[PDB]
Design a protein around this ligand. Sequence first.
Ligand code: HEM
Ligand SMILES: CCCCCCCCCCCCCCC(=O)OCCCOP(=O)(O)OC[C@@H](O)COP(=O)(O)OCCCOC(C)=O
Lengths: 55, 431
Amino acid sequence: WGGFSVSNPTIQRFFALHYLVPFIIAAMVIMHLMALHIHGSSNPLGITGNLDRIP
Amino acid sequence: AEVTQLSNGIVVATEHNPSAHTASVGVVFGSGAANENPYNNGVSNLWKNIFLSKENSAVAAKEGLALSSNISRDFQSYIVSSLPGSTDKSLDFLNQSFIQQKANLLSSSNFEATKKSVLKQVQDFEENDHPNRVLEHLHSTAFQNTPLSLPTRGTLESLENLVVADLESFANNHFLNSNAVVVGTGNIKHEDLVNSIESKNLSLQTGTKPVLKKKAAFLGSEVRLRDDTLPKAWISLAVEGEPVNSPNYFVAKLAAQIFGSYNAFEPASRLQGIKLLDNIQEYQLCDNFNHFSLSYKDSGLWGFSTATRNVTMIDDLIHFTLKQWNRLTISVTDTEVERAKSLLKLQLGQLYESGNPVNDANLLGAEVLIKGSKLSLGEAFKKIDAITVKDVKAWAGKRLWDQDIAIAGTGQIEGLLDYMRIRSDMSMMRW
Ligand code: HEM
Ligand SMILES: CCCCCCCCCCCCCCC(=O)OCCCOP(=O)(O)OC[C@@H](O)COP(=O)(O)OCCCOC(C)=O
């Protein structure tokens, strides 16, 4: 809180953190894509897709 | 160096050469593999081998006579060779054993022995000759459901159900005086050949061959024959081209000569003035390629064929080659045109002035069957020297720029991308 209740110090700190966390989500989205590039995507049948690929 | 044609109901063409040591005499017909149907495909290839069987070649060898034959899509040939003072014996053999009597050749024992050897020829071709079977597959996807699609050797399945009746039917319909040309090359004079023919009478059959229902049509498509156990990838790619007796016949040949042919292992072939070579040699994406411009009575093909061991960079090879083609519409220079002029003259100057009279006879008979006359080599050169940059750009803007393609491939072709990413490379976007 920064005090004894939800007050002015609470609302000013919640806005500065609210601007920040979107840029942390973006950095986790890049790490998410790196882990997909290793094995690529799956498919609705649940078997290998290395025999027929499209760019 | 001039040919002479006469007609008596029988056309007789001749290119006399007094300084040769042999003479060739034969008959050429105007029906090929594009004059048969999917049921009797290969009947012409089986006619060639009945002509070249043992007991007919033995009878010719006792007299000092050699035999030859050839099957193509528009024509067939049956040729006899001899020493220059033995040409009347050549005509007699061609009369007796071929046009008049053939019950000797179509016997029950000679037919089975011939069929066994031809089946082994075709089976061997389909398992070991990879550059040539991919070009045959290109013809079959480009012209599918049309007479110019059928292979010249025949197919192993259609070739098994043939009988002697199929041969006799095909002979009665296509081996006819209206569909025939009698040729003579080497040391043979026109008057002597004319005199020897009228001393006999020499007619095969009358005429009225069948008309072909369907006309040839090009269709953009692909066929992939994947085999991961072979050590290379073989690919051929083309567009629709020019037929014989077209105004753009020599301009399409000059354009193929601009990009030419390549062998990576020959040192002098790496030094040719071809701008495509500046792109391939740095990573060595191929072993060889060759550009072709094929022409028939109804249509044609223009393109290239290649073989490579670098199976992870196929997409770079196709991409760089198709971008060079785009320059024929936009930015082809004058130096590239003057080079291809003089190398095209050397090419067809060696094809039409070799020393073999057998090749002369096949060329002469095929040209006279279509045009009624042969264009001399001094005339063809003048047409080639009159081509300009504007003629090339006008031809390419109509035949190459954003046009459909046909593709065939075999071997390790995982790296060959889909149709529409290759089709998109036929235009630039940056013009
Ligand atoms: C900002 C949020 C996210 C973004 C931008 C994102 C992006 C992507 C993209 C572009 C793909 C490519 C394949 C596809 O579209 O299915 C993908 C796949 C995948 N994502 Fe996400 N993702 C996000 C959140 C999540 C979440 C919340 C989960 C699970 C809790 C998740 C799990 C997966 C999985 C398992 C795949 C692979 C599916 C497959 O290949 O079958 N992602 N993601
Ligand atoms: C033991 C002693 C240690 C003491 C020292 C303490 C220091 C500790 C921290 C060290 C610093 C971190 C190491 C540096 C590092 O990993 O990144 C810097 C290198 C460049 O980053 P990158 O991962 O190559 O780019 C990241 C790339 O490789 C991945 O690309 P991707 O984002 O997956 O592609 C998506 C783009 C698609 O394009 C679009 C968006 O359309």
